[PDB]
Amino acid sequence: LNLLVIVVDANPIWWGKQALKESQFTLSKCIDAVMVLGNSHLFMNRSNKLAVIASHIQESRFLYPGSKDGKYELLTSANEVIVEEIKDLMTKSDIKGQHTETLLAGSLAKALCYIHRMNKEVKDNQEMKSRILVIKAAEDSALQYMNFMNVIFAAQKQNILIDACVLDSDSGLLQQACDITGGLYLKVPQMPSLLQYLLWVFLPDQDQRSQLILPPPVHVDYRAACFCHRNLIEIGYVCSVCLSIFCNFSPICTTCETAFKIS
């Protein structure tokens, strides 16, 4: 079976900027597209299961743990729960000018441990191939690099595919993240037609991904820079403690304070 997890980056600052701009695309339509994708994923098979996480500047919250219109009961429950919870989360939110960058590493950590819990609980008879369909919507924060890299490596070890679906911006950190675990990287330039991209590129599971034509991976610039400048550097002088990429040879690296002996 397959356990899909949709990590939606519903950043109020950026989505409300879109709302003020009165652009055609809106967070409501984005949520509807994600809902349709999840419904289709479960539609694929009974054993398949899904979950949803929404990201905010403060924290990240799960959007998912009759036939009034003649509807499938389970998908109806999914629609109702996600709609109600997303509206509640968006309506209620404190204001903090100091912190405005969208948070994604914590949401991904929650997704990873949730997948681990489900893998533990599920019977050993059936093998579960989990996936994380990250949908970024705003620029990433520099300070989150370390934790995001930790969670990416944990996902690599635990065999989960991070399929990135960044839109309106190309996050180098996120493309690097999905490249490590082999997840697909699609940058949709037509936001209104986003759902067609999901039902083709992302929706097919790892089982059938190899035997299918999908957009080629984007080249990844594995840049390095010294802690002085944050500029690209091809040669780094790291020590045996900090393991930090530096500018030039120095008597002692500041982040270490070690008694380096010249020679």
Partner 1 sequence: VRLGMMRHLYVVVDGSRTMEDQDLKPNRLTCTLKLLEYFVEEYFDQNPISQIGIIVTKSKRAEKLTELSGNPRKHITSLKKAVDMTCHGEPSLYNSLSIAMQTLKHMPGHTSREVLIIFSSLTTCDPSNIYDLIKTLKAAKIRVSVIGLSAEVRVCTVLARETGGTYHVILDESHYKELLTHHVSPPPASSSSECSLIRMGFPQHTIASLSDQDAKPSFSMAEPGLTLGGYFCPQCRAKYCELPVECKICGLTLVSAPHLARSYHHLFPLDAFQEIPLEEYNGERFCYGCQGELKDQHVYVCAVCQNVFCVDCDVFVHDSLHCCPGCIH
Partner 2 sequence: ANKELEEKNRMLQEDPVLFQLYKDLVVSQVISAEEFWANRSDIIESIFRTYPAVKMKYAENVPHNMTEKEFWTRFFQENSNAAIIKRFNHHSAMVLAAGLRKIALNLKKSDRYYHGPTPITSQDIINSFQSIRQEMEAYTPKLTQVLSSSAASSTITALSPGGALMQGQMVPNDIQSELKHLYVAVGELLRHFWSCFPVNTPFLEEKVVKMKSNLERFQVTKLCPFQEKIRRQYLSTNLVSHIEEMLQTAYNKLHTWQSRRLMKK
3-state secondary structure of 210: coil
226 binds partner 1 (CB under 8 A): no
Task: Let me know if 237 is exposed, middle or buried by CB neighbors in 10 A (0-12, 13-18, 19+).
Answer: middle
59 binds partner 1 (CB under 8 A): yes
3-state secondary structure of 253: coil
Which residues neighbour 59 within 8 Å (Cβ) at sequence distance 6 or greater?
Answer: 103, 106
What is the x/- site pattern for partner 1, positions 18-57, by CB under 8 A?
A: ----------------------------------------
Which residues neighbour 111 within 8 Å (Cβ) at sequence distance 6 or greater?
Answer: 5, 7, 51, 53, 132
Task: Tell me how far, at minimum, the Cβ of 157 lies from partner 2, in Å.
Answer: 20
Nearest to 19 by CA among 30, 9, 8: 30
Q: Which is nearer to partner 2, 114 or 148 (CB)?
A: 148
115 binds Zn ion (CB under 5 A): no
Stretch that binds Zn ion, among 186-194, 205-213, 222-230, 247-255 (CB under 5 A): 247-255
253 binds Zn ion (CB under 5 A): yes
Q: Which is nearer to partner 2, 66 or 127 (CB)?
A: 66
HSE-up of 21 (CA within 13 Å, CB side)?
Answer: 11
Q: Which is nearer to Zn ion, 108 or 198 (CB)?
A: 108
What is the x/- site pattern for Zn ion, positions 159-188, by CB under 5 A?
A: ------------------------------
Q: Are 95 and 136 in contact (CB under 8 A)?
A: no
Task: Let me know if 65 is exposed, middle or buried by CB neighbors in 10 A (0-12, 13-18, 19+).
Answer: exposed
Instruction: Give the interface with partner 2 as residue ranges (CB under 8 A).
Output: 12-17, 19-20, 26-29, 31-33, 35-36, 79, 83, 86-87, 90-91, 93, 95, 97, 100, 142-147, 149, 172-173, 176, 186-190, 192-193, 195-197, 200, 215-216, 223-227, 230-233, 241-242, 244-245, 254-257
